[PDB]
């Protein structure tokens, strides 16, 4: 079903995450964590206090796809175990994955982002915010990830 998904996405905020390599997105998927440059870190922290859900939509550059999307479960924090990213970085955000499946850019060509000059939503710097309705429709385009139970995610909202 898509109903619990739509519930999680209600009045969420959305941010485009651009990764230069698959290694980091695979690490994020396995450990449920993300880290970013401080300009994006501050923006994500602000949004985390501002909305019921803050959704990160990941795309590896030159891959022609999105690799999934996740919901912030924490503000950034420092001092934990060091993640061996393939690389100045900010704190670590804890994330809950909502969909770990891919979506090719060819399937999102009809979605434009008003907060990036209405360019196709695939286009944007790392950290680009995606407007509410564009971001919702983008997440609904991903194939269902039947391995995730959103009941757990809903309780954190």
CB 16 within 8 Å of CB 126: yes
Q: What experimental approach yielded this model?
A: X-ray
CB 49 within 8 Å of CB 92: no
What is the extent of the structural domain holding 136? 1-157
Q: Is position 19 annotated in a ligand binding site?
A: yes
Token digits for 153?
A: 């995610």
CB 133 within 8 Å of CB 82: no
Distance CA 41, CA 111 (A): 26
CB 132 within 8 Å of CB 11: yes
CB 31 within 8 Å of CB 62: no
**3-state class (DSSP) for residue 104:** strand
φ, ψ of residue 61 to 5 degrees: the values are -60, 145
Q: Is position 85 annotated in a ligand binding site?
A: yes
- What CATH code is carried by the domain that includes residue 120? 3.10.590.10
Burial class (CB in 10 A: 0-12, 13-18, 19+), 84: exposed
Distance CA 43, CA 89 (A): 14
Helix/strand/coil percentages in the chain, nearest 5: 35, 25, 40
**3-state class (DSSP) for residue 26:** helix
Distance CA 137, CA 6 (A): 10
Q: Is position 6 annotated in a ligand binding site?
A: no
Token digits for 108?
A: 């999102």
Domain count, the chain: 1
CB 142 within 8 Å of CB 108: no
CB 109 within 8 Å of CB 120: yes
CA gyration radius for the chain?
Answer: 14
H or E element that contains 44: helix 38-50
Query: Would the CA dihedral through 77, 157, 8, 99 be positive or negative?
Result: positive
Q: Is position 34 annotated in a ligand binding site?
A: yes
Give the resolution in Å.
Answer: 1.8
């Amino acid at each position: 079903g898509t109903s619990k998904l739509k519930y999680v996405l209600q009045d969420a905020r959305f941010f485009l995450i651009k990764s230069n390599n698959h290694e980091n997105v695979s690490l994020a998927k396995a450990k449920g964590v993300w880290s970013t440059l401080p300009v994006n870190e501050k923006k994500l922290n602000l949004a985390f206090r501002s909305a019921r859900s803050v959704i990160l939509i990941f795309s590896v550059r030159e891959s022609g796809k999105f690799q999934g999307f996740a919901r912030l479960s924490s503000e950034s924090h420092h001092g934990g175990s060091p993640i061996h990213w393939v690389l100045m970085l900010g704190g670590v955000f804890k994330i809950d994955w909502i969909c770990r499946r891919e979506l090719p850019f060819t399937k999102s060509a009809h979605l434009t982002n008003p907060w990036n000059e209405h360019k196709p939503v695939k286009i944007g710097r790392d950290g680009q915010e995606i407007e509410l309705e564009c971001g919702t429709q983008l997440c609904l385009l991903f194939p269902p990830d039947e391995s995730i139970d959103l009941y757990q995610v809903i309780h954190k909202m």
